[PDB]
Ligand binder design. Structure first.
Ligand SMILES: O=C1NC[C@H]2CCN(C(=O)c3ccccc3)CC[C@H]12
Length: 284
C-alpha cells in the first residue's frame, strides 16, 4: 500500500499511538547480559537502553571490551550503521577508540550538548584549532582542522591520530543543531538536506567503515536518521518503490538495537521525511 495513502488514512483516523504500540509489541527481545554486568554501570547513560549481546560493538582491548553501541546491518539496502549513546565523561576515550577501530569516516550528532537545561552528552571534540584533546586511556589525539557553521547544521573536519603508530586520519563531524527541545520538526526539509550532505561526503559508502550515529540515548533521533536513509535507498533499488514498507524496515532494524523510534510523533515524522524525500529519488 503506497505509504502516502497509508499516511493520510492514519492521520484522518488519528491512530498514530495505535500503530506505534503495535510495533512496540512485535519488536525483538534479545539478551543484553554484558551491558548489565556491574563493572559496566558507569558506561551506560540510561538503565533502560542497552545494546543486544549479538550485535554490540566490541572494543579491541583485553581489559574491558564494552561500549553502549550496536551494529545495524541492512542486507537488502547494502548499508551498515553504528548507533551509540552520547558519550559520557568516562567513555569519551572509548568513543574515539571505536571510531578508529571500525574505520569510520563520519560521525553524525543529532543533539546539542545542553538541552532542556541539562547535559545530554560530554563535550567530546575540540572547539579551537590550537587546543587539541588527548585521550590518555586509549592513546588518541584529536585536533579541530576546520568548522563550517550553517543555519541548520555545522560540519567539522577533525584529525584523529593513533599515538601508538603515528597514523593520522581525517574524520568528518556532521552536527544537526536545530532539532527542537520538545517534539519533532514541523517540516522534514532541513533534516533531508542534512541527510543528503552526509551522503555526498562519502561517510555512508561501502569503501569506509560504518558511520557512527548518536543522540542522547542513540535510539530516537538516531533511529529516524537510519530508517529514513534505508527506506529511500530501497525505493531507488526496487522495481516497485510502492512495495517499501516503513513499519517492516523499522522492525528489521529493531532486531539489532532496542527502542528505535521513541514516540508516535517520531514515527509520523519518519513517514513524512520518506514521502517528501521520494519526490527527489523518483527523478525530480
Ligand atoms: O578509512 C578511513 N577512515 C577515515 C579516513 C581518514 C582520511 N582519509 C580521506 O580523507 C580520504 C582521502 C582520499 C579518498 C577518500 C578518503 C582516508 C581514509 C580513512
Amino acid at each position: 500500500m503506497e505509504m502516502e495513502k497509508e499516511f493520510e488514512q492514519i492521520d484522518k483516523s488519528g491512530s498514530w499511538a495505535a500503530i506505534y504500540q503495535d510495533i512496540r509489541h512485535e519488536a525483538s527481545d534479545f539478551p543484553s547480559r554484558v551491558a548489565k554486568l556491574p563493572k559496566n554501570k558507569n558506561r551506560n547513560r540510561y538503565r533502560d537502553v542497552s545494546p543486544f549481546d549479538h550485535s554490540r560493538i566490541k572494543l579491541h582491548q583485553e581489559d574491558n571490551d564494552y561500549i553502549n553501541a550496536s551494529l545495524i546491518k541492512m542486507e537488502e539496502a547494502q548499508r551498515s550503521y553504528i548507533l551509540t549513546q552520547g558519550p559520557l565523561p568516562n567513555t569519551v576515550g572509548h568513543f574515539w577508540e571505536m571510531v578508529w577501530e571500525q574505520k569510520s569516516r563520519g560521525v553524525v550528532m543529532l543533539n546539542r550538548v545542553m538541552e532542556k537545561g541539562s547535559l545530554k552528552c560530554a563535550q567530546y571534540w575540540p572547539q579551537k584549532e590550537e587546543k587539541e584533546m588527548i585521550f590518555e586511556d586509549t592513546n588518541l589525539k584529536l585536533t579541530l582542522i576546520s568548522e563550517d557553521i550553517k543555519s541548520y547544521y555545522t560540519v567539522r573536519q577533525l584529525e584523529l591520530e593513533n599515538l601508538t603508530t603515528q597514523e593520522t586520519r581525517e574524520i568528518l563531524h556532521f552536527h544537526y543543531t536545530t532539532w527542537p527541545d520538545f517534539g519533532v520538526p514541523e517540516s522534514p526539509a532541513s533534516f533531508l538536506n542534512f541527510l543528503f550532505k552526509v551522503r555526498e561526503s562519502g561517510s555512508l559508502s561501502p569503501e569506509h567503515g560504518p558511520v557512527v550515529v548518536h543522540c542522547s540515548a542513540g535510539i530516537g533521533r538516531s533511529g529516524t536518521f537510519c530508517l529514513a536513509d534505508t527506506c529511500l535507498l530501497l525505493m531507488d533499488k526496487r522495481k516497485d518503490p510502492s512495495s517499501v514498507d516503513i513499519k517492516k524496515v523499522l522492525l528489521e532494524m529493531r532486531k539489532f538495537r532496542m527502542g528505535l523510534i521513541q514516540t508516535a510523533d517520531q514515527l509520523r515524522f519518519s513517514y513524512l521525511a520518506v514521502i517528501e524525500g521520494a519526490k527527489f529519488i523518483m527523478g525530480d
